[PDB]
Design a protein around this nucleic acid. Sequence first.
RNA 1: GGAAUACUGCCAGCUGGGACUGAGGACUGCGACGUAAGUCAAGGAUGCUGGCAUAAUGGUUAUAUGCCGCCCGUCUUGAAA
RNA 2: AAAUAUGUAAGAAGUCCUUGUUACUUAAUUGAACGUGGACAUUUGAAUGAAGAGCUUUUAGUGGGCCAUUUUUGGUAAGCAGAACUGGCGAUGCGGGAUGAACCGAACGUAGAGUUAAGGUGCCGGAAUACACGCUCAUCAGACACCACAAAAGGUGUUAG
RNA 3: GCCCUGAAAAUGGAUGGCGCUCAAGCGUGUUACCUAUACUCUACCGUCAGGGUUGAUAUGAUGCCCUGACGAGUAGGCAGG
RNA 4: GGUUGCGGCCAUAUCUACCAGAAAGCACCGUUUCCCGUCCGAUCAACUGUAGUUAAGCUGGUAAGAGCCUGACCGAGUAGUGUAGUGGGUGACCAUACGCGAAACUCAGGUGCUGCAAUCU
Lengths: 159, 185, 58, 172, 49, 48
Amino acid sequence: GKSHGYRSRTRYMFQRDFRKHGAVHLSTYLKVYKVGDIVDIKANGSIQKGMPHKFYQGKTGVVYNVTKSSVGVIINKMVGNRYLEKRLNLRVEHIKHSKCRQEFLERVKANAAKRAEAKAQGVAVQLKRQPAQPRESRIVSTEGNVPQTLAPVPYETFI
Amino acid sequence: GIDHTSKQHKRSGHRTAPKSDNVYLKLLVKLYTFLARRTDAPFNKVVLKALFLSKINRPPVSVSRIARALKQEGAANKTVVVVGTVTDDARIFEFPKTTVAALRFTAGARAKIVKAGGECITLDQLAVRAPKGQNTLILRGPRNSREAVRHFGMGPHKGKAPRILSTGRKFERARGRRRSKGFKV
Amino acid sequence: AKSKNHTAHNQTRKAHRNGIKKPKTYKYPSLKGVDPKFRRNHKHALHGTAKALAAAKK
Amino acid sequence: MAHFKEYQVIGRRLPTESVPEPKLFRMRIFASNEVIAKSRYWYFLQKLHKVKKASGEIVSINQINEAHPTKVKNFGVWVRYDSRSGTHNMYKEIRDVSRVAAVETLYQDMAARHRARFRSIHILKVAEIEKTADVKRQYVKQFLTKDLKFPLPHRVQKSTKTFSYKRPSTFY
Amino acid sequence: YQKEYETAERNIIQAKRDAKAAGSYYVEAQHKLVFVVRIKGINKIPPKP
Amino acid sequence: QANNFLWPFKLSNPSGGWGVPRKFKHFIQGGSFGNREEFINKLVKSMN
RNA sequence: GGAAUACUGCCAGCUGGGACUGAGGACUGCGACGUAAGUCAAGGAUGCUGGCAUAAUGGUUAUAUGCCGCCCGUCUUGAAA
RNA sequence: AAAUAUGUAAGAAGUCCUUGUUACUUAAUUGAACGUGGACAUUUGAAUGAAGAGCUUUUAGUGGGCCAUUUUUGGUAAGCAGAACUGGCGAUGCGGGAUGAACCGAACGUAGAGUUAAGGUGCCGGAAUACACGCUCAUCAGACACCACAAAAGGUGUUAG
RNA sequence: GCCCUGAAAAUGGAUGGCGCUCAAGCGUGUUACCUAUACUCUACCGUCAGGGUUGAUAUGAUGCCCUGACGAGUAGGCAGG
RNA sequence: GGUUGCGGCCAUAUCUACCAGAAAGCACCGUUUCCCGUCCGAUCAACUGUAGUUAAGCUGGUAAGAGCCUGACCGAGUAGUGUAGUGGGUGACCAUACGCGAAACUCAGGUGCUGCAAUCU
Ligand SMILES: [Mg+2]
Ligand SMILES: [Mg+2]
Ligand SMILES: [Mg+2]
Ligand SMILES: [Mg+2]
Ligand SMILES: [Mg+2]
Ligand SMILES: [Mg+2]
Ligand SMILES: [Mg+2]
Ligand SMILES: [Mg+2]
Ligand SMILES: [Mg+2]
Ligand SMILES: [Mg+2]
Ligand SMILES: [Mg+2]
Ligand SMILES: [Mg+2]
Ligand SMILES: [Mg+2]
Ligand SMILES: [Mg+2]
Ligand SMILES: [Mg+2]
Ligand SMILES: [Mg+2]
Ligand SMILES: [Mg+2]
Ligand SMILES: [Mg+2]
Ligand SMILES: [Mg+2]
Ligand SMILES: [Mg+2]
Ligand SMILES: [Mg+2]
Ligand SMILES: [Mg+2]
Ligand SMILES: [Mg+2]
Ligand SMILES: [Mg+2]
Ligand SMILES: [Mg+2]
Ligand SMILES: [Mg+2]
Ligand SMILES: [Mg+2]
Ligand SMILES: [Mg+2]
């Protein structure tokens, strides 16, 4: 009959990257984690302890606990018509600071600053992002760029 | 047709009037809906609504509970309003003066309040004195203190009370309630 | 007689009638599963800062 | 795909700091309105240069009117097209007063004879044929002979009413 | 507003003629605004659209 | 804020028709649906 | 070289014919035209004329005519079966 | 190594400055948490929409499903059996497909006027025996999605290449 | 490409039928026209929502009045009769 | 700039072959009383820095060098794909419309960068 073990379906998911097998470099053990940090989970199948179950591969949550060798992470998982709150104890080999929370904090600073120079000039700011806008009129010149005219091409076999 | 985004002909989920047929209550209502409409004053809007509430949602406010609220800084002279009934409580000894407007006083509560030199007012009487609710303290009973609510949300690990009719060891205390008998909860 | 065996058909229609909402977020969340030593010391930390706040009210 | 107008479409890749002033390319496109013409411009450009209209822009679109819209010309028409079973190049000739008039009969003719709808044909070249008898195709040469005349036998007049009180004739 | 409009439109027209005159091409600003009309009725529609 | 204050416009069917045998193809393909660009004015005017 | 015309678009440009509707019921509003008093097509029709009395007209009913209309109830993915 | 699908973020529960608490932690008032006091509200930190948001109790029916496009497994195949996402039928009339559960259009209070959809306009039947360029003659022509089947292979028929 | 051969089944029969051959057939283009319980505008019924109003002043305050939107339904729930 | 110790990233750093390297460093290198380990002072331990050498290590150069890296309207807007039609086709399958978009290929360029501390003609 059917088979649904814990690591069922995981052959390509927990595999190591091509020409990247072996010891895990120390950077991984030098990152510091704080309650409230945002991490992305991604299994390292060379470290079998403290390992996220495969549903959580590729998912991002919040740190809620810090321990000798692991962080606890809060993931919101959808079961039925409702998210349930899940907490995971992942070892550090399987976790990584979320890079987008970093752009975000950087921008919050940038924002505070833009606000500062604006006030200490007493001017309007405009701090929120606009999306890509239509495009304004241009004049293209023809100096050195007299348009080359093209036509469709006859069918032909190359075999 | 229309791709409706929301239920059509849905009725606000709120009482619009008391379910009671007590003429007097309707009159208090008739008073307050004039007041609610014709003054600004958040107070009457609140008191208006509270008149519609069913009995489970007017839990009683007790006389010690009024004693306590009166100890709020800057509250001692407020007139305390209970859109429901006030009950006696042999547990405070020293009870202070004030003026309580309520739908109903139990006999002991009237006594208590009166004996301490205070006054018992009905809501229309409170209306004339305070058409805008000036210097009032609205109080509400503990609603989730009710026996019914002990059993809500009953389930594995929920910490709730079974709907049992009869209690002791020998009634729902064995398999599923202790590690030694199957599992625990 | 054999009958049908499984399907998800209709299941998302059903989940989305009332469904999905989201988490139920609070400030001051469940300290469930947080390091016991740590908590035990947090207690004492909080007691003390409470103490002093009241000490600064004479 | 209808009553045709012919357009110059001129476009280019969007400027980069690396290449401001990228090269300009033109096509002459036969279409009925300009929304079709620019579509058609991109369809061809994408088959000829790496560009999707998301990386390019149309710089100019201009209708090209026939210069001598009442001189009769004999046109050479070059066409690529798909059959149910392959794809073919084909040279045909058309006698008319305007390219736009010629092209439209090209499309009807590809439909009639080869069952080629519009999606299936590319116009490769269309050209007034300068010297008579560079004309190669009998069914157009026929008209080029000196003092050409012909009758139109068997004339059928349309009737305005349902009954007629005389037996009609075809006499021209 | 009558003026605003009248001179924006005129402006654009002359822009084009000047480019032509310089052997250039004026290329108009991309549209900032659209009107959209729904033309399909309401049955059988895929959730995302 | 201005645009939102405007309720959705309720147009009639176009008076004079859609001008194509079939609406549910693209304007580029013989008609109705998609961006017909400037030609929206003619269509909306007959619907309004 | 100077025009015209087509095509496409704009006008808070002027006008003819036909059709359905006329909800509301003192006055309050926004305006327009007037030098003015006043007038008005400006928060929903008025005015003038005529026709009908054992009648004009309306309800019902029978029948004809045009088009349309399978037997209900049930179980069922599916019943006129 | 795509496309489609998929996680998180886009701030007042935020930011910055000052310096309080502890039994944790550090060589160390060092960190870590949680705070006092002080400063910053026009765009306060993309878009679009919001027909109000949040929450509680309780209870009906159901728990045979089926169909279409697309992905897809078993099978020679099936109007066969079995999955994926969505939309349907079932529970639903209406207009079109002559007919028809499921296709196309479009979803429904009682009506008037106008306009259309999908589909049509010789006659049955409301609507051009309309306009335009070709192609086709069948002693078994052909005639419209789902759809009510046709192939290999041949023709000095006729067309254009 | 069209057409022809390849092309055999049982009651009599189906491009829906008649019939149609520079089509009423096949490919393509352009206009006009017909028509749904859909769209637009208006009346009326109901449902939901928001708002006004017993301040002294005849007859319904669960009433009167103003305004906007909405209406498919088996099993089934509730309501008003 | 060299060199060493401890590193970060982990081939632009690896591989094969041939050259070249001042100074200091590093190394090879001399010894076996001692602590210590071997079948074997080879490794491992200790001792001298004394007798020797750049041979090797190591560093750098060379190469139409193997690999690795990077770029490119090189291939290719191709393959594949989201969405659309009462589109074509007996079908297999294909074209068009609004979008997204590879890999191999080819050619061009490149062959470690860097943090801390010490030391050096
Ligand atoms: Mg095109
Ligand atoms: Mg392409
Ligand atoms: Mg082909
Ligand atoms: Mg083609
Ligand atoms: Mg469709
Ligand atoms: Mg478009
Ligand atoms: Mg087909
Ligand atoms: Mg150095
Ligand atoms: Mg680094
Ligand atoms: Mg020894
Ligand atoms: Mg030894
Ligand atoms: Mg030795
Ligand atoms: Mg040694
Ligand atoms: Mg060495
Ligand atoms: Mg070495
Ligand atoms: Mg070397
Ligand atoms: Mg090489
Ligand atoms: Mg595709
Ligand atoms: Mg598709
Ligand atoms: Mg076709
Ligand atoms: Mg198809
Ligand atoms: Mg394809
Ligand atoms: Mg292909
Ligand atoms: Mg687009
Ligand atoms: Mg790539
Ligand atoms: Mg480089
Ligand atoms: Mg460092
Ligand atoms: Mg050092």
